Amino acid sequence: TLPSALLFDCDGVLVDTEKDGHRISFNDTFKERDLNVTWDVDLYGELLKIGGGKERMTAYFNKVGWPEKAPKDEAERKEFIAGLHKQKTELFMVLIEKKLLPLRPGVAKLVDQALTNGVKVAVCSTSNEKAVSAIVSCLLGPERAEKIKIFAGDVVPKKKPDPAIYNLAAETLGVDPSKCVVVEDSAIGLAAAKAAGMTCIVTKSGYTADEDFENADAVFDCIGDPPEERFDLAFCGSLLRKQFVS
Ligand SMILES: [Mg+2]
């Protein structure tokens, strides 16, 4: 018996947004400005723990040194960082629009399995609506996008790990939560899903592989495409049958 709905997280599930999108936009900005700075995968992971985009650039330059092109004055440095971040933010949206952020393996396959088999599909994210809607429309394309309901940003007051986003999706779609499967990449998103009374499959992403997925119903490195498929729609349905303790 298939799920009534599949509910996908956006960042780390549909796309490896941080590793393959935000990090790239930082590097492309730095290159365009001739700063001679590159943030590779592992360093970027560390910088993700410091703060937001402006804060992690400030911390990085304070530690390693400011670029030769940067102003020396504290107020002018703050403006320089603001400019950099505005540029990075502009570029990241351009990257989506140009289709340069790849879907994760198996995403398009799984979405199409659902849509072709009468299973509802939604996306449930804390990210801003424009980016999430852009990811879906540009990267999954307009035919799929028309069928996919988006629940993002401030549509709920209580963000993950609160279940509000998942609950809203279930209510809106008109489906029983116990018949939904959520695909998440983070421990806090998993918490939201389980608190919503849903089955949750984790697909670890670039910066979440070491998080605590004990409460997940299944954990994988990705969804995958043949001939290296990790799971499919059928498996999502199978996973609805729980193994309780008699
Ligand atoms: Mg995520």
CB-count exposure of residue 72 (10 Å: 0-12, 13-18, 19+): exposed
* Distance between Cα 136 and ligand 1 center (Å): 15
- Look up the CATH number of the domain holding residue 41: 1.10.150.240
Residue 55 annotated as lining a ligand binding site: yes
Looking at the fold, whether 165 and 196 belong to one and the same domain comes out as yes
| Domain match, 93 and 77 both | yes
Query: CB–CB of 182/167 below 8 Å?
Result: no
Residue with tokens 């029983």: 176
Determine the distance separating the centroid of ligand 1 and the alpha carbon of 220, expressed in angstroms. Answer: 14
Same domain? For 86 and 117 the reply is no
**Minimal CA–CA distance to 133: which of 109, 104, 115, 153?**
153
Determine if the peptide bond prior to 142 is cis (ω within 30°).
Answer: no
Q: Residue 42 catalytic? A: no
Method: X-ray
Cα 76 to averaged position of ligand 1 atoms, centre (Å): 35
Give the span between the Cα atoms of 40 and 73, in whole angstroms: 28
For residue 152, the CA-to-ligand 1 centroid distance in Å is: 12
On whether both 237 and 127 belong to a single domain, the answer is yes
Instruction: Tell me, yes or no, whether 81 and 146 share the same domain.
Output: no
Is 86 annotated among the ligand-binding residues? yes
Residue 100 to residue 147: CA distance in whole angstroms: 23
Same domain, 2 and 116: yes
CA of 206 relative to ligand 1 center, distance in Å: 10
Pair (62, 143) in one structural domain: no
Count of domains in the chain?
2
Is 126 annotated in a binding site? The answer is yes
* DSSP code per residue over the chain: ---SEEEE-SBTTTB-HIIIIIHHHHHHHHHHTT------HHHHHHHTTT-SHHHHHHHHHHHH---TTS-SSHHHHHHHHHHHHHHHHHHHHHHHHTT-SPBPTTHHHHHHHHHHTT-EEEEE-SS-HHHHHHIIIIII-HHHHHHEEEE-GGGSSS-TTSTHHHHHHHHHHT--GGGEEEEE-SHHHHHHHHHTT-EEEEE--TTTTTS--TT-SEEES----TTS----HHHHHHHTS-----
Tell me which of 101, 116, 137 is where a domain ends: 101
Domain termination residue (choose one: 101, 121, 145): 101
User: Which of 101, 120, 136 is where one domain is finished?
Assistant: 101
Looking up tokens 């996306």, which residue turns up? 123
210 annotated active-site = no
What is the amino acid identity at position 14? L
If asked whether residues 165 and 231 sit together in one domain, one would say: yes
* Dihedral angle, C-alpha 119, 185, 245, 163, nearest 10 °: -70
> Annotated catalytic residue: which of 9, 16, 20, 217?
9
Cα 244 to its chain centre, rounded Å, is: 31
User: Residue 52, annotated ligand binder?
Assistant: yes
109 and 215 housed in the same domain? yes
Tokens of 215: 């409460």
**What is the b/e burial string over 25-61, where b = at least 16 CB atoms within 10 angstroms of the residue's CB?**
bbbbbbeebebebebeeeebbebbeeeebeebbbebb
114 CA distance to ligand 1 middle (Å): 20
In this structure, the answer to whether residues 158 and 232 fall within a common structural domain is: yes
The response to whether 204 counts as a known ligand-binding position is: no
Residue 12: partners with Cβ closer than 8 Å, 6 or more residues away: 18, 185, 186, 203, 205, 206, 207, 208
What dihedral angle (degrees, nearest 10) is formed by the CA atoms of 186, 191, 196, 201?
A: 50
Any known ligand binding at 127? Answer: yes
87 and 113 in a single domain? The answer is no
Q: Which two tokens stand for residue 85?
A: 């971040």
Distance between CA atoms of 136 and 107, rounded to whole angstroms? 11
49: nearest Cα among 211, 181, 245, 221? 211
C-alpha 162 – ligand 1 centre gap (Å)? 14
131 is in an annotated binding site: yes
Give the range of the structural domain holding residue 230, as residue numbers without chain letter.
Answer: 1-16+102-246
Quote the CA–CA distance of 233 and 173 in Å, as a whole number: 18
84 and 150 together in one domain = no
Burial of 180-209, coded b for 16+ CB within 10 Å and e otherwise, reads bbbbbbbbebbbbbbbbebbbbbbbbbbbe
**CATH number for the domain harbouring residue 242:** 3.40.50.1000
